[PDB]
Amino acid sequence: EKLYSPLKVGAITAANRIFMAPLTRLRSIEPGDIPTPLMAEYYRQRASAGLIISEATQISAQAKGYAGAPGIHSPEQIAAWKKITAGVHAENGHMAVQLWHTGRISHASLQPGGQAPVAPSALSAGTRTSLRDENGQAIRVETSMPRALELEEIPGIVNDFRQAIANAREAGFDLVELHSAHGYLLHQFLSPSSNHRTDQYGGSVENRARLVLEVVDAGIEEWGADRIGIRVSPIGTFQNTDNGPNEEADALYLIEQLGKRGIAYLHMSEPDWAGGEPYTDAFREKVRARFHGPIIGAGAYTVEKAETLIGKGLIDAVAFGRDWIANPDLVARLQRKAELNPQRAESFYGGGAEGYTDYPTL
Ligand SMILES: Cc1cc2nc3c(=O)[nH]c(=O)nc-3n(C[C@H](O)[C@H](O)[C@H](O)COP(=O)(O)O)c2cc1C
Numbered sequence: 001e002k003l004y005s006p007l008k009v010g011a012i013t014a015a016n017r018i019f020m021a022p023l024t025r026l027r028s029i030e031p032g033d034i035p036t037p038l039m040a041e042y043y044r045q046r047a048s049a050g051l052i053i054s055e056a057t058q059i060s061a062q063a064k065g066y067a068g069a070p071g072i073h074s075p076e077q078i079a080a081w082k083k084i085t086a087g088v089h090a091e092n093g094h095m096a097v098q099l100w101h102t103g104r105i106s107h108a109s110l111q112p113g114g115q116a117p118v119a120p121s122a123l124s125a126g127t128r129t130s131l132r133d134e135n136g137q138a139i140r141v142e143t144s145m146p147r148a149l150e151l152e153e154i155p156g157i158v159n160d161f162r163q164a165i166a167n168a169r170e171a172g173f174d175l176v177e178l179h180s181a182h183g184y185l186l187h188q189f190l191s192p193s194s195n196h197r198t199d200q201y202g203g204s205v206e207n208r209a210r211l212v213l214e215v216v217d218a219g220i221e222e223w224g225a226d227r228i229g230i231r232v233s234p235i236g237t238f239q240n241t242d243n244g245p246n247e248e249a250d251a252l253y254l255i256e257q258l259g260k261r262g263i264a265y266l267h268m269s270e271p272d273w274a275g276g277e278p279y280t281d282a283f284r285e286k287v288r289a290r291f292h293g294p295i296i297g298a299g300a301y302t303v304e305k306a307e308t309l310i311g312k313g314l315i316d317a318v319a320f321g322r323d324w325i326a327n328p329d330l331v332a333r334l335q336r337k338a339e340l341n342p343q344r345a346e347s348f349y350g351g352g353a354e355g356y357t358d359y360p361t362l
Pocket of ligand 1: 022025098179181182298299300301319321322323348349
């Protein structure tokens with residue numbers, strides 16, 4: 001089938017089309033938010049994927065919203081990431097980094113100096129984040145009250161993204177994925193429910209899509225379009241945040257803007273039944289007419305759904321998450337039609353090797 005054929009995603013050529021979606025695991029070394037050698041073994045076992053989009057990596061210390069998430073702003077962090085990308089490349093694999101800014105989804109205890117997290121508006125998130133207790137295990141705590149970002153502070157955010165993209169090329173990554181999704185800073189400014197600003201960065205799709213389109217333009221200049229990809233969640237409710245009443249009209253604007261820049265790929269996170277309506281083939285046809293590059297689909301995907309959409313030319317690859325968590329040889333299991341290992345969800349956040357590198361291969 002086409003799920004096992006090469007695809008040109010940006011400047012690299014993926015071996016297959018069964019990608020590994022970004023999966024936050026909260027296994028970094030604290031203090032410092034430094035990747036660990038155990039994470040290198042984790043990504044090494046799953047190098048069979050055509051493209052490995054790493055866990056959400058903070059662009060700066062202000063972007064730390066989850067205790068245990070890795071960073072790519074410190075020299076000690078870039079050193080560990082260089083060792084991880086080396087192992088993935090040593091197994092004929094391709095790995096990409098997902099740069100994010102947690103924004104309002106954060107806790108003041110993790111922010112530098114105990115300050116309140118930043119956001120487009122001071123509206124709360126309503127969701128919960130993950131911290132660490134005395135024993136180091138993950139605990140669910142409510143998000144702190146965010147602070148409205150000042151217009152003079154927005155160029156500082158764009159610069160930290162460009163600096164993180166620069167460190168990503170230094171860390172040996174093949175591509176970069178920007179977390180414009182799941183109710184995070186770049187999303188917080190894209191959804192009317194999250195951005196009640198009155199400046200040039202709020203109040204209209206153009207004003208609510210400028211910041212993200214800027215970071216995309218910053219990456220295009222620092223590295224190149226072939227190396228910059230974006231994950232978007234334009235339709236549906238993800239992590240207690242919706243996309244306003246004109247989600248479909250505002251989606252086609254940002255997609256057409258990203259389609260005129262020639263970015264590497266477009267990773268669309270699809271909602272389940274609780275979030276919203278599934279992606280209609282009429283809506284997918286509108287997205288493909290504006291974005292002429294590789295489109296990566298994720299969200300309750302099966303091998304049947306992936307093959308059908310790839311044949312229709314609506315998507316070029318599929319990204320699995322929990323299946324890659326529990327099946328390190330997922331590409332082998334899906335081609336041989338074998339059984340998938342059970343997913344132990346209690347070990348998805350925090351802990352050690354249990355639930356991380358203990359899943360056996362075929
Ligand atoms: C433990 C866990 C952590 C996740 N962390 C991220 C993240 O950091 N950034 C992101 O874009 N998506 C994240 N996701 C969502 C996945 O990327 C993927 O879109 C989602 O799991 C789709 O479900 P699926 O496995 O059925 O395809 C996470 C999912 C899980 C289960």
